[PDB]
């Protein structure tokens, strides 16, 4: 047990459900058998992250903020706004700092258009 | 093999190989004990009469080599599943 | 919890030795033994107040409870106690090794009797990577002889002679080495000390002509405590450990061992126990050290406590090693680690084994070489463990219904959920015979086809112990084929052999392929 | 606290000082040399754990600047340049004494009153050695360039020519013995075929000429003929601007010597003559015999004939010293009365201690070599009566004159009962004031048929009392830094402001308790510096 | 538990109170200096 | 100091006497720990007896790491050696 | 949703010789790491893949095969300011028991960053408001600032493993139905 | 005095084959093994 | 226990122990001398290496750096009996794997 790297990469929330769906596949007919600890915990994680989207193709989610890379270096927040209160710009004000005085263009409504494209 | 002829006495074993567990099992026991900790000695256990006392595997005989399981697999299916890092 | 644990199997790369410090003694110790009396007169069965077989130091009975760790007898691993002395004494084991680093030191300024650049030469023979225990103890002999040829120290210039034993068990510093230069800056004061005590008590012209400065074990540590750490490597020890000081090589605190190594042997000749030699030596140690602690607080004769502190010096020099008695002689630690089959020969080199037998032999031609015959009344006692598999499940079901009365059966059973074992005599067997979860182990009786070690007790050479196959026969002795009697040089006149059985699934294969 | 109380020499002091006011990274390495003696860099890194090779060279240059080690170089015939590094003892006494020099500038520089460099003259001692070495251009190029620093620069030659501002050289950055070896065979550059006979005289002509060279090279620091440059323009005098200089202990330790030696006056006389004798010493420490006396550190001290010569010259220099032999005339006008001179110094002749006794009639000097060994006897016996009963003080005085005392004559000489002396006497075998010596009346030194004698043993009684206090320094310093381990959150919060109204309560009690530490540290340090007249 | 104290244990005087202030800014100068 | 491939393969090609006392030692307890067999068993018990039978057809799925005394590896599969 | 390249040594019992190499070590690492915390890293959930595997060894005593293997798994570490719309099922009178329903409920985050009119009322409410009230079983929005990873075992409930720092400082904090 | 499975109150010691193990009567599980005598 | 009336258990003496290693067998040698005879399980601490009770170190009370192994009991009490006088058998540990 040795730790080599802690933050080796960043994975989108799509593959959190996409690889799990394959792991739900080879798991002997889950969720429909009404008539291991991985049997219990993966129940609670498959109906938590996709709920905000619910109450799809990967090529749409791969090209959301590729055209919306209107930054210089501070672009690590492109991954985090994927399911954070869609179709609202009053919630994006408390997420990112110093954008009340930097983004005063149509980009602040273009962030509204990208966030309303999928919802 | 160390430059001189020498017996198998107490004086003879004091120059063959100084390992205090092997010398504790001979006639004089405790005279090789007190001077050992007085000199802050440090001996590795690989003697036959040493692993017997420590209850470990003897390094010789049928305990020379070690046994290895074949893992019968290559890197043709050891690829990552990485995609969509940040776009 | 939601926490992970990950542990690896580990090995011992090699021991290293040390003498633990005077602060390490109270580190692992947890009780203190200030009082003397073993049995309290409350007259409970284990009456132990403070300084005795303490129930949270350990436990010496199968009816008590170890209050520290837990358990009655098997769970206690033993725990150390400690003593406190009023004033230090020598270590009898280090008594030889405490004058060797004392000849090299100054007796007035506490410095090594060498010059500056000379000792800079000696440690170069230490700093090369190739140094074994032969040459390291060789060059420590050579540097010590250099220091004995140097009369007067470099810091305060006081001359030193030689120091040796006074043969009790104390050492004397033979100071003044005059040849023809009696004009010493110390002798005139030594004559000044001489002259003033010639008028009072005139009976001193004879006995003061020999009497000389001693080094009692109170002066010696306060002679060691002010030496520097920059030159402990010139006398065998290293620094950088906390226990590297030469202060810790005489007794100032002594620990008490656990009671598991000195158990209260109950001989059942009385309602009282024959209490062993270690406790009845350790009892007066704290008793003598108590009256010196209390007597010097009250105020007693220094002509009286001098021999008491010498009595305490000699008594600790016998609790450890009882060779210094100079007289039924009491046993000790060193009195059992050496000798014929005291330790290291009958306890560590040659132990005692389980699952054996020792019967007479009788010849048999009509069975083959590599097969020995075993009688059945020993064959339904000596068992061999056997894990269940899908291959041998069918046979072991028929084997477990036999029980421990007919020959091809079992004695004990251990399910992998069960913790200790289960006996086969008590409880229903056929009701237990049905389940036998395949991941468990049972202990069948010995049967024809297993692997048996067998040898003569006076062993000539490596070809006196061999392996054989077994065969069950209804008589009451060991029958072997006759042509192998020449290795064992047996004579069939009442000599008795002993057989062994391995109890793995691996060493059973070991004995055939090499000792068959 | 038993883990510190037993297994720690004054190494517990020295590891604490670099832990006290320095980074943590050098605490392990400065212990590693003194636990080992000498080691160079190429074996330094293997003994320690957690520091790389150039990480040591990053760290070693830190304490090299503050004069905490003293380096040396040695070459081999086949080997390269090997840098054997030694250990400095007196350079960390600056770090130990560092507050007491600040109150030594004030109490010795008394010509000034109501000066506006009072804050500044305390800052230069905090500047000259806390930054390491110091040269003249280091303070001239500060935030003030000219800014009336001619009143400050010419003030420094007053503070330099009064002493203890010697320019450092290779002599100060090396120890005293390893330079003696290089000059020893410098005086043995003699071919053996010039006059080979009487071979025991051959090191004699080596040692008598190197003795004059060692006396010359120890004056090279004190050679004030080149520490000063005459200014033809706009300045009266100044020291040379290309001089890198520090402060040392030599005037300070001799200054604390007389500061300690004035304390016997207020005991042995009242207040009138104690004011008189202050003037009699202050003119003398500018050039006195050295208190450490570095000429007797390591050499031919082991044989008696040279050991006689180490004080056969020192007293003759002391008696014939021009720098301290005062006429007993000019001191009367230094008091802010020629009859009162030879009357108030008449009791200096009649007092029971050898000060101001032997001299030519009319002119006086202060004898040194036979004076401080009785000062060591004065205060040590007084501390024996401090912490236990004064019956021990009766016993302590009794042994030095009744030589090799017994317990029969102890009742003719001293007068107490036989219930309280043996309780007191045994309280002094434990503390190493007396030495037992047993004489037997039978064979093999039997204990019962024997009697016993005592002895003073003026060596081990004082070695015990020295290191009993040397541990008592850092025992308080270890309780200093554990107080900084506690309350560690708000102290950095109090150091980032440059305010909770109940938090400030827990800041005052931790500040006044540590204030008593530095107060009591100065007390025991004065008791410890008495035993440094060795 | 240890008896027999040193006899130097007393309230701080103003003669050494300012002398003790010269220590606390000394170590703060070194630590907030270069090293 | 690392594994040497088949180029500098410079020891005996032969399964020595101490080898088959160890493989048959360490094969047989795997059979007692419910490992699958590879050879056609009969009605057969005693997992040592099935171990020495499987060695005849060299169907052991193992490989022996012979150490040189300088700290070097050397690999030998159990089928590569002969007896 | 981040990867953590770590190494580990693992064994398998010999009855899993019929199952192939990769799936056998996957199973033995699943029940070793599933729903488990790591000292000073986080909580790993499932092994993502296998980077490289090393030749197997054997203890002479046990008889199993021992393999050291390097791999990264999935571990969620959102951000030091990340919005999370979790739920709640508990309320206490010194802070708020915002605890994620379903996955982990070892989270107690206080209120130290809001207006000065905050206390506790024993009338089904958090405090009296100067504003739709919030209750259990609904999306309650909160963010993350710090965490404390302490793993002490003083042998002689508050599980000290995974504790987070939260805030509700701006408007709209306490319920997601206050916006949108 | 109390077994771990059936909580049996009576313990019988088997001296037949000199194992000297202590077994509860009801279910047959052993209570202690390898006795420790006082020589 | 030595003696037939005290239930026996024979002494595999020192002379037989030389005859085992002349075969070169190294696996029943441990099995006949500690497995069937003197197996006892000891928890030892990694740093400041010596044993402690059920889950402790009792000289650095951390309960953290503890490794479970099994040693001969006749070697365990030696690590108490030799520890009774002032000789400290400091143990130093490695792992078997990753040669
Ligand atoms: Zn440890």
DSSP class per residue in D9-31: -THHHHHHHHHHSS-GGGHHHHH
Tokens of C11: 């090995």
- Is C73 in Cβ contact with H17 (below 8 Å)? no
Interface test with F, best of C384, C389, C509 (most F CBs within 10 A): C509
**For residue G48, with 0-12 CB atoms within 10 Å meaning exposed, 13-18 middle and 19 or more buried, which class applies?**
buried
Distance (Å, whole) CA G109 – CA G111: 7
Q: How far is the CA of I57 from the centre of ligand 1 (A)?
A: 7
CA-to-CA separations, G95 to A86, D427, G92, G99, G119, in angstroms, rounded: 29, 63, 6, 12, 9
Distance (Å, whole) CA D147 – CA D366: 45
Residues shown for chain C: 516
H-assigned helices in D75-218: 91-96, 102-108, 118-128, 136-140, 150-161, 178-184, 204-217
**For residue C212, with 0-12 CB atoms within 10 Å meaning exposed, 13-18 middle and 19 or more buried, which class applies?**
middle
Give all domains of chain G, ordered by start, each with its CATH number: 1-76 (3.30.1490.120), 82-178 (2.40.50.140)
Closest partner residue to E4 (CB to CB) among D20, D100, D388 is: D388
Neighbours of chain A (3+ CB pairs under 8 A): B, G
Minimal C-alpha gap between B82 and chain A (Å): 8
- The 8-class DSSP code of residue G15 comes to G
Minimal C-alpha gap between C467 and chain B (Å): 17
* H vs I: CB pairs below 8 A: 6
Distance (Å, whole) CA C319 – CA C283: 11
Cβ contacts of I16 within 8 Å, gap of 6 or more: C350, C455, C459, C465
Is residue I93 classed as helix, strand or coil in its secondary structure? strand
Q: What are phi and psi of I91, to 5 degrees?
A: -90, 145
Cβ < 5 A residues, ion ligand 1:
I 45, 47-49
CB of C338 within 8 Å of any CB in chain I? no
Query: Which of C29, C23, C49 is CA-nearest to residue C38?
Result: C49
Minimal C-alpha gap between B74 and chain G (Å): 9
Residue pair I65/I46 in contact by the 8 Å Cβ criterion: yes
CA-to-CA separations, B80 to A56, G9, G50, in angstroms, rounded: 24, 20, 7
Query: Which of A41, C424, B40, A63 is CA-nearest to residue G46?
Result: A41
I19 is in an annotated binding site: no
Query: Which of D204, D322, D196, D336 is CA-nearest to residue D276?
Result: D336
Torsion of CA F21, F23, F29, F33, to 10 degrees: 180
Domain that holds residue C317: 1-91+236-340
Query: Which of D406, D409, D402, D465 is CA-nearest to residue D433?
Result: D465
Minimal C-alpha gap between C408 and chain G (Å): 28
Residue pair C312/C289 in contact by the 8 Å Cβ criterion: yes
Distance (Å, whole) CA D403 – CA C499: 81
Tokens of A9: 């990469």
CA-to-CA separations, C103 to C156, C213, C231, D287, in angstroms, rounded: 17, 15, 15, 43
The H or E element containing residue G85 is strand G83-86
Q: How far is the CA of C27 from the centre of ligand 1 (A)?
A: 13
CB of C18 within 8 Å of any CB in chain B? yes
Query: Which of G77, G97, G87, G85 is CA-nearest to residue G142?
Result: G85
Cβ contacts of B1 within 8 Å, gap of 6 or more: none
Q: What are phi and psi of F72, to 5 degrees?
A: -120, 145
H-assigned helices in C401-456: 430-433
Give the DSSP letter string of C356-370: EEEEEEEE-SSS-TT
* Chain E residue whose CA is closest to D5: E2
Sign of CA dihedral D15, D20, D23, D24: positive
Residue pair G66/G57 in contact by the 8 Å Cβ criterion: yes
Q: How far is the CA of C15 from the centre of ligand 1 (A)?
A: 13
Minimal C-alpha gap between I45 and chain F (Å): 29
H34 is in an annotated binding site: no
Neighbours of chain I (3+ CB pairs under 8 A): B, C, F, G, H
Neighbours of chain B (3+ CB pairs under 8 A): A, C, F, G, I
The H or E element containing residue C500 is strand C496-500
Residue pair A12/A49 in contact by the 8 Å Cβ criterion: no
Task: Quote the radius of gyration of chain C (alpha carbons, Å).
Answer: 34
Is residue C302 classed as helix, strand or coil in its secondary structure? helix
CA-to-CA separations, D410 to C193, C253, D95, D114, D455, in angstroms, rounded: 16, 34, 48, 61, 13
- Last residue within a domain, chosen from C340, C364, C398: C340
Q: Are strands C31-32 and C81-82 parallel, antiparallel or unpaired?
A: parallel
Give G-chain residues touching I58 at CB under 8 angstroms: none
* Chain G residue whose CA is closest to A86: G180
Resolution value, angstrom units = 4.2
* C vs H: CB pairs below 8 A: 46
Give D-chain residues touching C202 at CB under 8 angstroms: none
Distance (Å, whole) CA D339 – CA E7: 42
Torsion of CA C29, C33, C38, C42, to 10 degrees: -100
Minimal C-alpha gap between H30 and chain I (Å): 19
Closest partner residue to C216 (CB to CB) among D404, D423, D436 is: D436
Q: What are phi and psi of C131, to 5 degrees?
A: -140, 115
Distance (Å, whole) CA D224 – CA C134: 58
Tokens of H16: 């037949």
Distance (Å, whole) CA D423 – CA C298: 6
Angle at the Cα of G118 (from G117 to G120), degrees rounded to 5? 135
Instruction: Please name every residue paired with G96 in a beta bridge, in sequence order, or none if there are none.
Output: G109
* Chain F residue whose CA is closest to I23: F18
CB of C345 within 8 Å of any CB in chain B? yes
Neighbours of chain G (3+ CB pairs under 8 A): A, B, C, F, I
Distance (Å, whole) CA D29 – CA D32: 5
Closest partner residue to E19 (CB to CB) among D103, D472, D516 is: D103
The domain that holds C428 is classified in CATH as 3.30.1490.180
Is residue C159 classed as helix, strand or coil in its secondary structure? strand
CB of D520 within 8 Å of any CB in chain E? yes
* CB count in 10 Å sphere of residue C24: 24
* Chain H residue whose CA is closest to C355: H19
* Experimental technique used to determine this entry: cryo-EM
* Chain G residue whose CA is closest to I31: G61
C445 alpha carbon, distance to own chain's centre: 39
Query: Which of D389, D388, D319 is CA-nearest to residue D354?
Result: D319
CA-to-CA separations, E23 to D17, D20, I23, in angstroms, rounded: 13, 11, 76
Q: How far is the CA of I59 from the centre of ligand 1 (A)?
A: 8
D200 alpha carbon, distance to own chain's centre: 37
- Is I7 in Cβ contact with H18 (below 8 Å)? yes
Q: What are phi and psi of G167, to 5 degrees?
A: -155, 155
CB of G70 within 8 Å of any CB in chain I? no
Minimal C-alpha gap between C465 and chain F (Å): 17
Tokens of D285: 């420490």
CB of G51 within 8 Å of any CB in chain B? yes
Query: Which of D516, D483, D485, D490 is CA-nearest to residue D505?
Result: D490
D and E: touch, per 3+ CB pairs < 8 A? yes
Q: Are residues C15 and C77 in the same domain?
A: yes
- The 8-class DSSP code of residue D247 comes to -
| Fold of the domain built from segment(s) F1-83 | Eukaryotic RPB6 RNA polymerase subunit (3.90.940)
**For residue D122, with 0-12 CB atoms within 10 Å meaning exposed, 13-18 middle and 19 or more buried, which class applies?**
middle
- The 8-class DSSP code of residue C112 comes to B
Distance (Å, whole) CA G150 – CA G159: 9
Query: Which of I23, C509, I68, I14 is CA-nearest to residue B52?
Result: I14
Tokens of G74: 């999935």
CB of H37 within 8 Å of any CB in chain I? yes
Tokens 């004089």, residue? Answer: B28
Scan residues 463-482 of D and list those with Cβ closer than 8 Å to C.
463-464, 466-467
Domain ranges of chain F: 1-83
Phi-psi region of B83 (alpha: psi -120 to 50; beta: other; left: phi over 0): beta
Neighbours of chain H (3+ CB pairs under 8 A): C, I
Q: Are residues C240 and C323 in the same domain?
A: yes
Residue pair D354/D313 in contact by the 8 Å Cβ criterion: no
- Structurally, chain C folds into a number of domains equal to 4
* F vs I: CB pairs below 8 A: 3
Tokens of D372: 């401080």
Minimal C-alpha gap between D232 and chain E (Å): 38
* CB count in 10 Å sphere of residue D7: 19
* CB count in 10 Å sphere of residue C18: 22
- Is C30 in Cβ contact with I89 (below 8 Å)? no
Q: How far is the CA of I90 from the centre of ligand 1 (A)?
A: 9
The H or E element containing residue G165 is strand G163-167
Residue pair C416/C442 in contact by the 8 Å Cβ criterion: no
CB of B24 within 8 Å of any CB in chain I? no
- The 8-class DSSP code of residue F66 comes to P
């Amino acid at each position: 047990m040795k730790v080599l790297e802690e933050r080796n990469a960043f994975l989108s929330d799509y593959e959190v459900l996409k690889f799990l769906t394959d792991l739900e596949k080879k798991h002997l007919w889950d969720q429909k058998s009404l008539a291991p600890e991985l049997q219990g915990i993966t129940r609670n994680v498959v109906n938590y992250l996709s709920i905000n989207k619910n109450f799809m193709s990967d090529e749409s989610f791969a090209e959301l903020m590729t055209k919306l890379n209107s930054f210089k270096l501070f672009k690590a927040e492109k991954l985090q706004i994927v399911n954070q209160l869609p179709a609202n710009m009053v919630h994006l004000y408390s997420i990112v700092e110093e954008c009340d005085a930097r983004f005063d263009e149509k980009t602040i409504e273009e962030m509204l258009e990208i966030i309303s494209g999928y919802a | 093999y160390k430059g001189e002829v020498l017996g198998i006495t107490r004086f003879g074993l004091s120059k063959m190989r100084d390992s205090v567990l092997q010398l504790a099992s001979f006639e004089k026991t405790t005279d090789h004990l007190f001077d050992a900790a007085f000199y802050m000695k440090k001996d590795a256990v690989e003697g036959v009469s040493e692993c017997i006392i420590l209850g470990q595997t003897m390094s010789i005989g049928t305990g020379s080599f070690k046994v290895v399981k074949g893992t019968n697999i290559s890197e043709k299916d050891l690829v990552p599943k990485r995609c969509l890092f940040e776009s | 919890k939601e926490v992970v644990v990950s542990e690896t199997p580990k090995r011992i790369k090699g021991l290293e030795f040390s003498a633990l410090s005077a602060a390490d003694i109270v580190a692992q110790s947890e009780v203190e033994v200030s009082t003397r009396d073993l049995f309290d007169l409350e007259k409970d069965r284990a009456p132990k107040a403070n300084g005795a077989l303490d129930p949270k130091m350990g436990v010496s009975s199968s009816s008590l409870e170890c209050a520290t760790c837990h358990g009655n007898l098997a769970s206690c691993h033993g725990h150390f106690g400690h003593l406190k002395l009023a004033l230090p004494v020598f270590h009898i084991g280090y008594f030889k090794a405490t004058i060797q680093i004392l000849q090299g030191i100054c007796k007035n300024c506490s410095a090594i009797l060498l010059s500056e650049t000379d000792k800079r030469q000696f440690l170069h023979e230490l700093r090369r990577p190739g140094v074994d225990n032969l040459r390291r103890m060789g060059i420590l002999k050579k540097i010590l002889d250099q220091c004995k040829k140097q009369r007067r120290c470099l810091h305060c210039g006081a001359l030193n002679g030689v120091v040796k034993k006074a043969a009790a068990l104390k050492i004397i510093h033979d100071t003044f080495r005059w040849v023809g230069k009696k004009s010493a800056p110390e002798k005139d004061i030594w004559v000044g000390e001489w002259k003033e005590v010639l008028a009072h008590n005139p009976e001193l012209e004879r006995y003061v002509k020999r009497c000389m400065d001693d080094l009692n074990p109170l002066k010696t540590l306060n002679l060691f405590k002010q030496i520097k750490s920059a030159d402990c490597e010139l006398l065998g020890i290293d620094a950088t450990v906390p226990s590297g000081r030469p202060e810790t090589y005489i007794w100032r605190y002594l620990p008490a061992p656990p009671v598991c190594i000195r158990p209260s042997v109950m001989m059942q000749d009385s309602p009282a126990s024959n209490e062993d030699d270690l406790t009845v030596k350790l009892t007066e140690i704290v008793w003598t050290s108590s009256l010196i602690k209390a007597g010097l607080d009250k105020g007693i004769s220094i002509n009286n406590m001098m021999e008491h502190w010498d009595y305490l010096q000699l008594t600790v020099a016998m609790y450890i090693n009882s060779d210094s008695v100079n007289p039924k002689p009491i046993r000790g630690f060193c009195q059992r680690l050496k000798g014929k089959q005291g330790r290291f020969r009958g306890n560590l080199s040659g132990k005692r084994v389980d699952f054996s037998g020792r019967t007479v032999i009788s010849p048999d031609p009509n069975l083959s070489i590599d097969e020995v015959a075993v009688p059945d009344r020993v064959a339904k006692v000596l068992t061999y463990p056997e894990k269940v598999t899908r291959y041998n499940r069918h046979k072991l079901q028929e084997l477990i219904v036999n029980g421990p009365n007919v020959h091809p059966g079992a004695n004990y059973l251990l399910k992998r959920n069960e913790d200790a074992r289960r006996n086969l005599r008590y409880g229903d067997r056929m009701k237990l015979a049905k389940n036998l979860q395949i991941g468990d182990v049972v202990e069948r009786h010995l049967e024809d086809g297993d692997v048996v070690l067998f040898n003569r007790q006076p062993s000539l050479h490596r070809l006196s112990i061999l392996s054989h196959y077994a065969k069950i026969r209804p008589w009451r002795t060991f029958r072997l084929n006759e042509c192998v009697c020449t290795p064992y040089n047996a004579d069939f006149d009442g000599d008795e052999m002993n057989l062994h059985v391995p109890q793995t699934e691996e060493a059973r294969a070991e004995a055939i392929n090499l000792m068959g | 606290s038993l883990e510190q109380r037993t297994l720690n020499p004054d190494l517990f002091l020295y590891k604490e000082l670099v832990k006290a006011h320095l980074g943590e990274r050098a605490a392990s390495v400065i212990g590693m040399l003194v636990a080992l003696g000498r080691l160079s860099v190429r074996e330094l890194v293997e003994k320690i754990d957690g520091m790389d090779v150039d990480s040591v060279k990053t760290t070693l240059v830190s304490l090299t600047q503050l004069r905490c080690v003293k380096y040396l170089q040695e070459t081999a015939i086949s080997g390269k340049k090997t840098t054997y590094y030694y250990y400095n003892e007196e350079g960390i006494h600056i770090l130990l004494y560092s507050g007491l020099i600040i109150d030594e500038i004030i109490t010795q520089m008394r010509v000034n009153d109501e000066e506006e460099h009072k804050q500044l003259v305390a800052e230069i001692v905090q500047n000259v050695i806390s930054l390491g070495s110091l040269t003249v251009e280091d303070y001239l190029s500060s935030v003030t360039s000219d800014s009336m620093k001619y009143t400050i620069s010419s003030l420094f030659v007053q503070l330099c020519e009064m002493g203890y501002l010697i320019q450092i050289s290779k002599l100060h950055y090396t120890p005293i013995e390893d330079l003696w070896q290089f000059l020893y065979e410098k005086h043995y550059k003699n071919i053996p075929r010039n006059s080979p006979l009487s071979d025991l005289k051959k090191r004699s002509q080596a040692k008598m000429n190197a003795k004059t060279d060692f006396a010359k090279i120890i004056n090279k620091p004190n050679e004030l003929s080149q520490i000063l440059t005459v200014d033809p323009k706009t300045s009266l005098r100044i020291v040379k601007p290309t001089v890198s200089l520090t402060i040392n202990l030599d005037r300070f330790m001799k200054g604390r010597r007389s500061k300690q030696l004035i304390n016997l006056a207020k005991t042995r006389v009242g207040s009138v003559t104690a004011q008189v004798y202050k003037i009699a010493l202050r003119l003398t420490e500018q050039k006195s015999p050295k208190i450490r006396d570095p000429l007797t550190q390591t050499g031919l001290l082991q044989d008696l004939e040279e050991a006689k010569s180490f004080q056969d010259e020192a007293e003759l220099v002391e008696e014939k010293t021009p720098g301290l032999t005062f006429n007993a005339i000019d001191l009367a006008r230094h008091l802010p009365s020629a009859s009162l001179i030879n009357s108030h110094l008449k009791i200096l002749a009649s007092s029971n201690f050898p000060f101001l006794n032997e001299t030519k009639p009319g002119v006086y000097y202060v004898p040194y070599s036979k004076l401080m060994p009785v000062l060591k006897s004065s205060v040590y016996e007084y501390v024996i009566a401090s912490t236990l009963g004064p019956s021990a003080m009766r016993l302590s005085r009794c042994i030095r004159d009744n030589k090799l005392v017994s317990e029969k004559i102890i009742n003719s000489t001293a007068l107490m009962k036989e219930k309280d002396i043996r309780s007191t006497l045994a309280s002094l075998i434990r503390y190493n004031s007396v030495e037992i010596q047993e004489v037997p009346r039978t064979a093999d030194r039997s204990a019962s048929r024997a009697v016993f004698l005592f002895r003073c043993k003026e060596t081990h009684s004082y070695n015990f009392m020295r290191q009993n206090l040397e541990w008592n320094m850092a025992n308080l310093l270890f309780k200093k830094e554990k107080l900084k381990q506690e309350n560690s959150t708000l102290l950095k919060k109090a150091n980032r402001d440059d305010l909770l109204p109940s938090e400030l309560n827990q800041l005052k009690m931790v500040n006044e308790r540590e204030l008593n530490v530095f107060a009591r540290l100065s007390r025991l340090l004065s008791l410890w510096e008495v035993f440094q007249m060795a | 538990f240890p008896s027999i104290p040193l006899p130097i244990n007393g309230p701080i005087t103003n003669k050494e109170r300012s002398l003790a202030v010269k220590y606390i800014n000394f170590g703060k100068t070194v630590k907030d200096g270069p090293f | 100091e690392k594994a040497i491939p088949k180029d500098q393969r410079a020891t005996t090609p032969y399964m020595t006497k101490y080898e088959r006392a160890r493989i048959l030692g360490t094969r047989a307890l795997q059979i007692s720990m419910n490992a699958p067999v590879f050879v056609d068993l009969e009605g057969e018990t005693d997992p040592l007896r099935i171990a020495m039978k499987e060695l005849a057809e060299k169907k052991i799925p193992l490989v022996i790491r012979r150490y040189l005394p300088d700290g070097s590896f050397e690999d030998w599969s159990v089928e590569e050696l002969i007896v | 949703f981040i990867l953590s390249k770590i190494a580990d040594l693992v064994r398998i019992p010999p009855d899993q010789f019929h199952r192939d190499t990769i799936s056998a070590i996957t199973h033995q690492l699943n029940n070793k790491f599933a729903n488990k915390i790591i000292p000073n890293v986080g909580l790993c959930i499932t092994i993502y893949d296998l980077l490289t595997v090393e030749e197997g060894q054997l203890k002479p005593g046990d008889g199993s095969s021992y393999i050291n293997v390097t791999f990264r798994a999935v571990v969620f570490k959102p951000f030091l300011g990340e919005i999370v719309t979790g739920w709640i099922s508990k309320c206490t009178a010194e802070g708020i028991k915002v605890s994620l329903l379903g996955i982990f409920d070892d989270i107690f985050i206080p209120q130290n960053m809001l207006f000065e009119g905050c206390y506790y009322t024993p009338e089904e409410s958090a405090w009296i408001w100067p504003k739709l009230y919030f209750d259990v079983n609904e999306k309650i929005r909160f963010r993350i600032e710090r965490e404390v990873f302490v793993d002490v075992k003083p042998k002689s409930e508050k599980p000290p493993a995974y504790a987070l720092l939260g805030s509700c400082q701006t408007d709209g904090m306490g319920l997601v139905s206050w916006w949108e | 005095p109390v077994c771990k499975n059936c909580h049996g109150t009576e313990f019988e010691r088997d001296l037949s084959n000199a194992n000297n193990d202590l077994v509860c009567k009801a279910c047959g599980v052993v209570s202690e093994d390898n006795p420790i005598v006082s020589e | 226990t030595e003696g037939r009336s005290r239930d026996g258990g024979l002494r595999l003496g020192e002379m037989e122990r030389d005859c085992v290693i002349a075969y070169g067998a190294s696996q029943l040698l441990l099995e006949r001398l500690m497995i069937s005879s003197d197996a006892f399980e000891v928890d030892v601490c990694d740093k400041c290496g010596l044993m402690g009770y059920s889950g402790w170190c009792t000289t650095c009370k951390s309960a953290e750096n503890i490794i479970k192994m099994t040693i001969p009991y006749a070697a365990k009490l030696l690590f108490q009996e030799l520890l009774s006088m002032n000789i400290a058998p400091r143990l130093r540990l490695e792992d078997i794997f990753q040669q």
